[PDB]
Amino acid sequence: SQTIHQWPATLVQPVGSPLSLECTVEGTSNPNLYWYRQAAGRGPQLLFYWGPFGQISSEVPQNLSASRPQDRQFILSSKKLLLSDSGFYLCAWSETGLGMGGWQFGEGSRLTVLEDLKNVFPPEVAVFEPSEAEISHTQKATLVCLATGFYPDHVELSWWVNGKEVHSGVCTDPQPLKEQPALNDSRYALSSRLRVSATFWQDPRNHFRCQVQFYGLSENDEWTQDRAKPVTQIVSAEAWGRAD
Amino acid sequence: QKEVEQNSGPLSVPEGAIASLNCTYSFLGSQSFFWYRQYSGKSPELIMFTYREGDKEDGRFTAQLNKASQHVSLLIRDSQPSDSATYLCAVNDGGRLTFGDGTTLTVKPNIQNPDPAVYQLRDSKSSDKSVCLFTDFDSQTNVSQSKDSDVYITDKCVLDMRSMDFKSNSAVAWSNKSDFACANAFNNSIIPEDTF
Amino acid sequence: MIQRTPKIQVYSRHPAENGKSNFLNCYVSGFHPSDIEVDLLKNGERIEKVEHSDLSFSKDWSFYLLYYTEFTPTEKDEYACRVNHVTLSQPKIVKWDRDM
Amino acid sequence: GSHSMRYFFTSVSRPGRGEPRFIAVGYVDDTQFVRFDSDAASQRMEPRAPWIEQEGPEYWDGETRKVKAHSQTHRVDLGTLRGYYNQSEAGSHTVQRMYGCDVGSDWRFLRGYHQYAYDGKDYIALKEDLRSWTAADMAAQTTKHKWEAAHVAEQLRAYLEGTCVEWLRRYLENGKETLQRTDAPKTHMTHHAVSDHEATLRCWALSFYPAEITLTWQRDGEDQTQDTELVETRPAGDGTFQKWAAVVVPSGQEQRYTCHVQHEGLPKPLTLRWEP
Amino acid sequence: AAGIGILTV
Predict the structure, then answer these.
(1) Which residues does the annotated region (Alpha-3) include (chain D)?
(2) I need a labelling partner for D161 at 20 to 30 A (CA). Which of B61, B196, C37, C52 fits?
(3) Among D156, D234, D14, D26, which residue's Cα sits nearest to residue C30?
């Protein structure tokens, strides 16, 4: 049971902030360890390739270094982040040497680097209840959830039914919409549906929560705005099961 | 990507069919080859690898290699909708993997008993705020954005009720206008709703 | 573990003419470990400008090195290869002569 | 005629001095063509023959990465093998690895090989088929089961039958004014004695390539094992190689025996009798 | 050099 976890998952930071990403492998010894970076539309590109005793290869990225404090712990960092450093940072290992064992990436670390933190908003969340028509037509009830006006573009929506999370019956928009497709710094919307039996929905015991994890500023980040700092937070909406 | 070329997509295959994805590497000295799957938002997940001429089968997947033409393929038997993903080709050019930019695949689900309907869902919180829901159309239908501003409508989307054997297409539209009508003019099929 | 003592030939590249530039060669082969002391001598003093082949080995895992310098040989010349290894109880000098 | 490609890897641990000494070297037939020496500045795989320099930077970049990765794996090995051998950290040890592929005159695969020594003796080696492993002893058997579970042998076969042969072919046609060009030997005859008649003579091959030179001494009238004694073929230091065979004769004056010299670069095997 | 099959003992 080899494994590889990377931390943190998602980061929003200003130009010039320092960056630190961590990666740990388990269940293998002396692995080759890799940092890759992935841009939208593109395949992973190599940054660093390290043997168990040190660096073998780097694609010499300006403004980025790697290090390896333990055998199984690996680290990517930057002193002042440029904008261009936005991306999807991915770590992998391969079994010692030149062979076929390993080649697995961890769960990746998504970094967005903003010139300006004023544009950062969390989502407003809204659940809409099933059509009383739809119900009579199909004996099925769809709820819609609406995450709106968020920036930057990355949230994580989930449905909760009596406080257990549920997957059966869900689909969520694969990527979000620009509310103003004209402006390059437009905020975003994203929908999701949960569809359940009509009888299910008509039982008031039952309780429905749409949940949106938003990734936003660090607690300590520079801020001039009247409004409360738009940090990482969960914003939800909710509905209860109704008859007629 | 000179080093590793894949067609981008999006490429549609229909549920049940064989999806067949190609790759052309240019580094003569590659000695092993790798296919990865990447769901929207996620890190790539290793489907399989090969270091020799010919076919490698792992259940529904088959990797193929032709050193002579520096060509690699993946074949996915009996395609499910949950195979929709980006398929990333990689070549080991010496101690590391070099990647193409992927082909994105879409497996359009098979809608057995289509019931194309458009509904008005109202808000939990007491507001003149509402959304239109185009649901239960079949996969031949494609949904278009409103090229009227301040009305949003999402792309179509597949949802299993795993235990009712039932798949549903769905698309959502809304606006924050005082004059929004769920009769919103794009493709249509038939409307089994006339409000009140 | 095994150790293997070296075999040593000291020689010329081409046929050494008296008044002509040439290469003085010392070929050590058959030996294990790889760590080996080789020296080329002019008149029993060592030459400072000396180089060697990258280290390779044989089907028995033995090393060979070719140590050389360029030189003009002198009628009265006292050229020689001096060579130490762990397998030698003391160093071992081998004399060049044209002809062998 | 036939050709080969071999890669030779040598790793020597240094109690203390952190990093072991790794020297890697590449040959087509008897011509070195790449090297790596962990100790040197470049820290790259370097060319050692005119015709490999044609290869572009992508080639060099990957030969470099693989060679370094080899080096780091022998690094691990040294420590692992200490453990298997109950050895202390003081004392220097040697890991060595050679592999390659032979082709016949049609340039097809004949034989591939992959061997590994520790302190100068056989540790584990790929058999003739390219699937079973000869393992010296106990420690070697733990390496054996490990590599069997991982199908090392089939990875090596893919490399050895295919890739190794494909590139050897490329290198022979790329380097063809070197590797396929065949230098016959130049030809001597040396009479030694002392001031009472006691004499021996040896025929010399000089400046020949490739290195195999079978060189006989015809017994005027014989049986088919016969008593010469010869130095090993030695490098000239430029391209070529050089060698001599000596047979002993009557303490004074005899032209009864003669040098049968057969070198691939030589239509007519080369007879030579003694004269000034 | 080889790309595949090269492992620690």
Answers:
(1) 183-274
(2) B61
(3) D234
Residue with tokens 């590599």: D147
According to DSSP, the residues that pair with A58 across neighbouring strands are A48
Tell me what percent of chain C is helix, strand and coil, each rounded to the nearest 5: 0, 50, 50
What residues contact residue D72 under an 8 Å CB cut-off, 6+ apart?
Answer: A51, A52, A53, A54, A56, A96
B53 φ, ψ to 5°? -55, 135
Q: What is the Rg, in whole angstroms, of the alpha carbon atoms belonging to chain B?
A: 22
Q: Which residue of B has its CA nearest to A34?
A: B96
Measured between alpha carbons, how far is D75 from B56 in angstroms, rounded to an integer?
34
Instruction: Spell out which residues of chain B touch residue D58, defining contact as CB-CB under 8 Å.
Output: 27, 93
Q: What b/e sequence results for C37-70 when a residue is b if at least 16 CB atoms lie within 10 Å of its CB, and e otherwise?
A: ebbbbbeeeeeeeeeebbbbbeeebbbbbbbbbe
| CATH code of domain B1-109 | 2.60.40.10
- Give the residue among C92, C75, C73 at the shortest CA–CA distance from C83: C92
Neighbours of chain A (3+ CB pairs under 8 A): B, D, E
- Of chain D, the end-to-end C-alpha distance in Å amounts to 36
Please name each of the domains of chain C with its CATH number: 1-100 (2.60.40.10)
What span, in angstroms and rounded, lies between the C-alpha atoms of A219 and A232?
9
Question: Encoding tokens for residue A8?
Answer: 């943190």
CB atoms within 10 A of CB D55: 17
3-state secondary structure at position D61: helix
Topology annotation, domain D182-270:
Immunoglobulin-like (2.60.40)
* Structural determination approach: X-ray
Closest-CA residue of A relative to E5 is: A99
Beta bridge partners of A166: A159
Query: Encoding tokens for residue D124?
Result: 């584990």
Name residue A33's beta-bridge partners. Answer: A50, A93
Q: Nearest CA to CA, how far is A95 from chain E (Å)?
A: 8
Tokens of A63: 């403004």
Parts of chain D belonging to CATH 3.30.500.10: 1-181
| Distance between CA atoms of residues A187 and A180, nearest Å | 7
Gap between the Cα atoms of B186 and B188, Å rounded: 6
* Cβ contact E8–A96 (<8 Å): yes
Does the beta-carbon distance from A99 to D70 stay under 8 Å?
A: no
Phi-psi region of B177 (alpha: psi -120 to 50; beta: other; left: phi over 0): beta
Nearest chain B residue to E6, by CA: B95
One-letter amino acid identity for C26? C
- Which helix (H) or strand (E) segment holds residue D54: the answer is none
Contact E1 D152 (CB under 8 A): no
Q: Give the one of C1, C27, C62 whose C-beta lies nearest to D119's C-beta.
A: C1
Phi, psi of D143 (to 5 degrees): -75, -45
The residues, ordered by sequence, that sit 6+ positions from A131 with a Cβ below 8 Å of its Cβ are A142, B119, B120, B121, B133, B193
* Resolution rounded to one decimal, in angstroms: 2.8
Residue keyed to tokens 């680097």:
A113
**Which chains lie within 8 Å of chain D at 3 or more CB pairs, if any?**
A, B, C, E
